Design an enzyme around this catalytic site. Sequence first.
Site, short mmCIF file in Angstrom:
data_model
loop_
_atom_site.label_atom_id
_atom_site.label_comp_id
_atom_site.label_asym_id
_atom_site.label_seq_id
_atom_site.Cartn_x
_atom_site.Cartn_y
_atom_site.Cartn_z
N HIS A 1 29.52 -3.03 -15.36
CA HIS A 1 30.31 -3.98 -16.13
C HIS A 1 29.36 -4.89 -16.89
CE1 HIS A 1 33.35 -3.32 -12.73
NE2 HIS A 1 33.89 -2.78 -13.80
N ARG B 1 32.91 6.32 -18.52
CA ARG B 1 31.86 6.93 -17.71
C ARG B 1 32.03 8.44 -17.59
NH1 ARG B 1 33.54 3.02 -12.72
NH2 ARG B 1 35.52 3.42 -13.80
N1 LIG Z 1 29.50 1.50 -14.63
C1 LIG Z 1 30.49 1.31 -15.64
N2 LIG Z 1 30.00 1.53 -16.85
C2 LIG Z 1 30.82 1.39 -17.95
N3 LIG Z 1 32.16 1.02 -17.83
C3 LIG Z 1 32.67 0.79 -16.56
C4 LIG Z 1 31.85 0.94 -15.49
N4 LIG Z 1 32.56 0.67 -14.38
C5 LIG Z 1 33.82 0.35 -14.73
N5 LIG Z 1 33.90 0.43 -16.05
C6 LIG Z 1 34.79 0.25 -17.11
O1 LIG Z 1 35.02 -1.03 -17.30
C7 LIG Z 1 36.51 -1.24 -17.23
C8 LIG Z 1 36.98 -1.98 -16.13
O2 LIG Z 1 36.70 -1.30 -14.90
P1 LIG Z 1 37.43 -1.68 -13.46
O3 LIG Z 1 38.99 -1.90 -13.64
O4 LIG Z 1 36.77 -2.88 -12.80
O5 LIG Z 1 37.10 -0.47 -12.49
P2 LIG Z 1 38.15 0.57 -12.01
O6 LIG Z 1 39.25 0.79 -13.09
O7 LIG Z 1 38.80 0.05 -10.71
N6 LIG Z 1 37.36 1.97 -11.74
P3 LIG Z 1 36.38 2.18 -10.39
O8 LIG Z 1 34.92 1.96 -10.86
O9 LIG Z 1 36.56 3.65 -9.88
O10 LIG Z 1 36.72 1.16 -9.27
C9 LIG Z 1 37.11 0.26 -17.30
O11 LIG Z 1 37.36 0.55 -18.75
C10 LIG Z 1 36.24 0.96 -16.79
O12 LIG Z 1 36.19 2.44 -17.19
#
Ligand SMILES: Nc1ncnc2c1ncn2[C@@H]1O[C@H](COP(=O)(O)OP(=O)(O)NP(=O)(O)O)[C@@H](O)[C@H]1O
Lengths: 157, 157, 158
Positions: free
Chosen positions: B16, B89
């Site tokens: 993030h 990703r």
């Molecule tokens: N390492 C990363 N690199 C780039 N984008 C990310 C990354 N991790 C999460 N995201 C992106 O940032 C946004 C918010 O992610 P978030 O809602 O916190 O995680 P999530 O949807 O719960 N997925 P997960 O990492 O499996 O728990 C989404 O568009 C994600 O695809």
Amino acid sequence: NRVLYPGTFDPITKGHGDLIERASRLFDHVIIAVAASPKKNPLFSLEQRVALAQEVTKHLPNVEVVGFSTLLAHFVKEQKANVFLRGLRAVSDFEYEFQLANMNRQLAPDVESMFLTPSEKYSFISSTLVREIAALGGDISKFVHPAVADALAERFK
Amino acid sequence: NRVLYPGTFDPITKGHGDLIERASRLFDHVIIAVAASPKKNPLFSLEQRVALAQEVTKHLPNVEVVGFSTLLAHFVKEQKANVFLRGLRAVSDFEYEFQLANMNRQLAPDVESMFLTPSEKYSFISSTLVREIAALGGDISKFVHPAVADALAERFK
Amino acid sequence: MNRVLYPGTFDPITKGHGDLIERASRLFDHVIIAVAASPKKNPLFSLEQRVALAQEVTKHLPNVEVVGFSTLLAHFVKEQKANVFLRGLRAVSDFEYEFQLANMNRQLAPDVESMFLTPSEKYSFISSTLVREIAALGGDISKFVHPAVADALAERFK
Ligand SMILES: Nc1ncnc2c1ncn2[C@@H]1O[C@H](COP(=O)(O)OP(=O)(O)NP(=O)(O)O)[C@@H](O)[C@H]1O
Ligand SMILES: Nc1ncnc2c1ncn2[C@@H]1O[C@H](COP(=O)(O)OP(=O)(O)NP(=O)(O)O)[C@@H](O)[C@H]1O
Ligand SMILES: Nc1ncnc2c1ncn2[C@@H]1O[C@H](COP(=O)(O)OP(=O)(O)NP(=O)(O)O)[C@@H](O)[C@H]1O
């Protein structure tokens, strides 16, 4: 080479067993690491899942079954294994394993992550599918060892 | 341009963080909108997750952190933001963001949806993975900011 | 001659589901919408309600019927003497899950075909999960759902 095949195995299926037969032929020592996985409310206890995996695999001399509830990257060092074995049935498997392999490379750098893909005869077998079919009285004898079928049969009545 | 980066951030990770540093360099105003996300049973509360994201972005002046529990297509208007930022990703992310973007196009037609891909160095980092490893005492310091690492450490004790 | 069975959770039935039902009714003699109880999904609407909603949205189609069921799908399709499954494919995710489910059903019901439609791009993104989450937060979902279903969501979140 000592390989560790970790999973929830709830229950162990002919899909798992094919991979174990192939691993048994490739490596000197194969350990089946049955993960506790309490946050999945597994149908079977860790004790039963270990017991079914043993029964289905007793005929292979270099294969062992063990249960664990610690971090996989820690447990593999406790078992002194240098290789992870995982199976790839579909893109969702590949993605997840791809990420977990990069992750375990950080946590356990001396442990290789290696993959096999299923025989087309077992590519579609899911533990979730076997469970959901057995719970509704469908015949799952084509997807599991007889002892496991017997176990599913008993578990739902 | 005021870009809005919505997510659950449970907790905020170096993946993030990389996207935020790169967005702050590209847009005049960046808002990190932390979703309540009750259906995900977050390890951290919305208040802690906001505090953590703010702590990690403290040094970026054109970046702000806000918590919200309303519909994203309403909140973006309430924030007067004209761009969505999301991360890609893997095929799984791509599929989902693709569907969510056609959906947000109906609900918020004046808002663009845009994507960044992570540096290969953070590509494999998952929040879910970070949580599950920290919950078993594995070292997660390489995937998160020091304040976040401390917060995981304290969270399981 | 062909009796097709479209099984799903339909929580609630959607305009994406509806397009497939429209296209299938033009294609087959008999179309059965088999609504799965799906207790393992803790569905927002009851089976009774999902069936009723699926019926209201399909009353204008004469060769279409709606029925609820909570038994194994491979047993139920035989019980309805249907010879083909209809499923929808919106994305890679559907494709994987459906591919795996078809091979599994081939074992359990060898004389039942599995066939697929893809959505019109205007309904490609519509998900029941999406509609539910938007309504629960008071969003306008009238472009994704039939008016009876929209009304049903609004009342259910009040
Ligand atoms: N390492 C990363 N690199 C780039 N984008 C990310 C990354 N991790 C999460 N995201 C992106 O940032 C946004 C918010 O992610 P978030 O809602 O916190 O995680 P999530 O949807 O719960 N997925 P997960 O990492 O499996 O728990 C989404 O568009 C994600 O695809
Ligand atoms: N039929 C199969 N063929 C090849 N590999 C498989 C098969 N089934 C499971 N596996 C692989 O072997 C490992 C252990 O499986 P396991 O953890 O018991 O299933 P799971 O990933 O939790 N999901 P599920 O099988 O749907 O309950 C997984 O890494 C799988 O990728
Ligand atoms: N908009 C759509 N267009 C085409 N097929 C669809 C659509 N929505 C659902 N389906 C298909 O119709 C079948 C029944 O869907 P159903 O299980 O009730 O909803 P779902 O797949 O769980 N949707 P969701 O809960 O939001 O992930 C599945 O084979 C679906 O992939």
